[PDB]
Amino acid sequence: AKIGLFYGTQTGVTQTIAESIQQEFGGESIVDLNDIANADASDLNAYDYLIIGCPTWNVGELQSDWEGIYDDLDSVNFQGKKVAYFGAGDQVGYSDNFQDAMGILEEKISSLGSQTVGYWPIEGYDFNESKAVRNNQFVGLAIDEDNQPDLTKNRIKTWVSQLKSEFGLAL
Ligand SMILES: [Cl-]
Ligand SMILES: [Mg+2]
């Protein structure tokens, strides 16, 4: 596929979101769904367009599968790659750490020369601090199934439509 979606899941939520994102793009012909627990770093090298999915459920720590590959991200040539991000989190229970893991990953991958795409507005949320916020925007799509499960569908549809322009799929 044109787009490689790599996700780490903890409670299953990230996988569910990953499948919805794939569906909204057009299905398996357009987006490959890859569990990062099953991937080598070289698997990310094969895509010009990447979507990186990671939940935040333990403050200070990355999801275990992303933590295990984090140092090997250096073996990927990220130069020229367009990379989007999404994360599941709880903005009420983790108001000081909302979507931290998504921000940790974007910071690493952007430092390797990739171009972040898919910035997302913070105004639809209620939180105090986030490592994923740059210049009053999220680095990617923030999902909260605990507090805003009714918003997830239209957030994904809106974000994917925005990514199609940045990923050159728009007509
Ligand atoms: Cl999860
Ligand atoms: Mg390197």
UniProtKB/Swiss-Prot annotation:
Keyword list, A-Z: Electron transport, Flavoprotein, FMN, Stress response, Transport
Cofactor list: FMN
Pfam families reported in the protein's UniProt record: Flavodoxin_1 (PF00258)
Domain Flavodoxin-like: 3-164
Induction: By iron stress.
SUPFAM superfamilies assigned to the protein according to its UniProt record, in alphabetical order: Flavoproteins
GO terms, molecular function: electron transfer activity; FMN binding
Function: Low-potential electron donor to a number of redox enzymes.
PANTHER family xref list: FLAVODOXIN 1, FLAVODOXIN 2
Similarity field: Belongs to the flavodoxin family.
Name assigned to this protein: Flavodoxin
Gene that encodes the chain: isiB
